[PDB]
Design a protein around this ligand. Structure first.
Ligand SMILES: *[C@@H]1O[C@H](CO)[C@@H](O[C@@H]2O[C@H](CO)[C@@H](O[C@@H]3O[C@H](CO)[C@@H](O)[C@H](O[C@H]4O[C@H](CO)[C@@H](O)[C@H](O)[C@@H]4O)[C@@H]3O)[C@H](O)[C@H]2NC(C)=O)[C@H](O)[C@H]1NC(C)=O
Ligand SMILES: *[C@@H]1O[C@H](CO)[C@@H](O)[C@H](O)[C@H]1NC(C)=O
Ligand SMILES: *[C@@H]1O[C@H](CO)[C@@H](O)[C@H](O)[C@H]1NC(C)=O
Lengths: 97, 97, 48, 49, 114, 49, 49
């Protein structure tokens, strides 16, 4: 504004507007993508609390690795931190059955 | 006020940028103590929730007793669990420690 | 805060209304997500 | 914070059972979206009329 | 498949409480689920056994099936509703003896009267 | 355009709706399906002033 | 459909009979369900009504 008169001033302001409108559209598009993702993830967290923590799971790999025994949950900065305690076998031998 | 009386913590301080750039970070739905209350009550429910049929009754049983039922349920016999209760607790403790 | 800019911004339609509404909805989504998640972690009965 | 029913553990070979004496049925309603409205655009007309 | 065509055992997957039956109707952009659950109330506290053993015959032990052994001597109740009934072979299973099982010497239930 | 560069086959992209389809995919062979194409325009029959 | 093993056979049984098996399956004994069949149906009906 300080340097240019309206017919050119307009064009220059308009460049800044286009760039900023673009930036805000990109921002919003990502907040929508990120909030959609977090919401799906939240439903996964819901399932793990019910399947993992409030129950012993029989689903291989759903909770942790190995055979699930017990899980615990604490809060984390943007969600939940699952602590899955599993049973891990070792020193397998072969026998006849 | 922190961003005025102290100013930005470092280069590219995105919290102080809010009052400059025109954006605001909003607080979360629950405060920390409430979230802690939820996971604390969850911890105390584990032994007595994953115990028997239905989701309606609560068995206020020791955590240790719950673990032994959980281990029995995956194929470790009771004779083994009975002989090894201290060994099992120690291994569990090593896993978490 | 520049009036000339605001005057030109108006020719792009209700741009800012769209930005605000999109984010408002996106923000409500987390409050709903959190409320639902915690409603489910919540125990009926628990030991101290 | 809505506290859960507190059920104490016992220093014994027994345990406390918090068990219902009554019940009700209730309905959890849930909506799952499976579709969105399908739209096509005559882009050439939209842009240039 | 989990809710409507089957009774679910997954807490919170279908509705709240214990799932019994679900129904489905169409909705403007999808399906509307109608989940009927069992909601307990008026909980009471009772004292329960982990299992019961014949005191004279300590290797002969039982555990409740989908319920609890409660004091009232011992009786059985289903897990979702307090309603004491006799301990019988239809509500018990034989188990290996454990340190937490009670040694009973008087009113032995029929599965232990051997 | 053939290997030798001559045009042996062509589509008039405004002839009909089927032709519009081929042009939008830039191909003489498109997959089966139901596709939206440019609308059939109403045209002025006169003017008012 | 939600009655027994496999997805291949269909038991054309009353809805009410299905409910009682569903309740028995979650821990309510048969003695209870038998004494309370009208109470159970009424509670169910209240939940949907
Ligand atoms: C109902 O009756 C049962 C059966 O008598 C009773 O449970 C038994 O209690 C005794 C102790 O009172 C257990 O015997 C020992 O307890 C000590 C406790 O520290 C253990 O350390 C011993 O283990 C060593 O010796 C074992 C002998 O074989 C070894 O196998 C083991 O590796 C150790 O070396 C031992 O357990 C007895 O084992 C239990 N019985 C069962 C089946 O667990 C029960 O308590 C009575 N009910 C009530 C409520 O009192
Ligand atoms: C009671 O609790 C204390 C806690 O250390 C324990 O040492 C003691 O053995 C317990 N008594 C019984 C009967 O379990
Ligand atoms: C169960 O709760 C309902 C709620 O009104 C009550 O009317 C009914 O009498 C209760 N039954 C028992 C056994 O308390």
């Amino acid at each position: 504004i300080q340097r240019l008169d309206p017919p050119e001033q307009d064009a220059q302001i308009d460049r800044l507007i286009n760039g900023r409108l673009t930036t805000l559209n990109a921002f919003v598009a990502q907040q929508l993508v990120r909030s959609e993702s977090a919401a799906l993830s939240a439903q996964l967290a819901k399932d793990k609390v019910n399947e993992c923590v409030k129950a012993q799971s029989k689903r291989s790999g759903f909770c942790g690795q190995g055979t699930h025994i017990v899980s615990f949950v604490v809060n984390a900065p943007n969600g939940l931190y699952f602590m899955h305690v599993g049973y891990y076998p070792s020193n397998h031998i072969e026998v006849v059955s | 006020d922190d961003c005025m009386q102290q100013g930005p913590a470092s280069a590219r301080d995105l919290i102080c940028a809010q009052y400059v750039a025109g954006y605001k970070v909003l607080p979360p739905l629950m405060d920390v103590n409430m979230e802690a209350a939820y996971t604390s009550s969850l911890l105390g429910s584990i032994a007595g929730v994953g115990w028997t049929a239905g989701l309606s009754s609560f068995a206020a049983i020791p955590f240790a007793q719950s673990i032994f039922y959980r281990l029995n349920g995956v194929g470790i016999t009771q004779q083994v669990l009975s002989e090894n209760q201290k060994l099992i607790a120690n291994k569990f403790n090593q896993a978490l420690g | 805060g520049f009036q000339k800019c605001e005057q030109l911004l108006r020719e792009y339609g209700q741009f800012c209304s769209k930005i605000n509404q999109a984010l408002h909805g996106a923000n409500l989504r987390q409050d709903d997500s959190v409320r639902n998640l915690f409603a489910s972690v919540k125990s009926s009965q628990s030991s101290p | 914070f809505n506290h859960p029913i507190q059920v104490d553990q016992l220093n014994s070979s027994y345990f406390k059972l918090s068990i219902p004496t009554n019940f009700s049925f209730g309905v959890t309603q849930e909506y799952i979206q499976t579709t969105i409205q399908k739209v096509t655009v005559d882009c050439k007309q939209y842009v240039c009329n | 498949n989990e809710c409507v065509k089957a009774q679910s055992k997954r807490s919170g997957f279908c509705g709240q409480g214990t799932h019994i039956v679900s129904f489905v109707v169409n909705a403007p952009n999808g399906l509307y689920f109608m989940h009927v659950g069992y909601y307990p109330s008026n909980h009471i506290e009772v004292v329960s056994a982990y299992g019961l053993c014949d005191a004279a015959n300590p290797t002969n032990c039982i555990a409740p099936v989908n319920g609890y052994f409660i004091k009232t001597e011992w009786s059985y109740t289903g897990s979702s509703f307090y309603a004491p009934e006799p301990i019988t072979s239809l509500n018990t299973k034989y188990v290996a003896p454990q340190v937490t099982y009670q040694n009973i010497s008087t009113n032995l239930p029929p599965p232990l009267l051997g | 355009f053939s290997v030798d560069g001559y045009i042996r086959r062509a589509i008039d992209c405004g002839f009909n709706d089927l032709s519009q389809l081929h042009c939008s995919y830039e191909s003489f062979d498109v997959e089966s399906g139901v596709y939206s194409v440019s609308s059939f325009e109403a045209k002025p029959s006169g003017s008012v002033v």
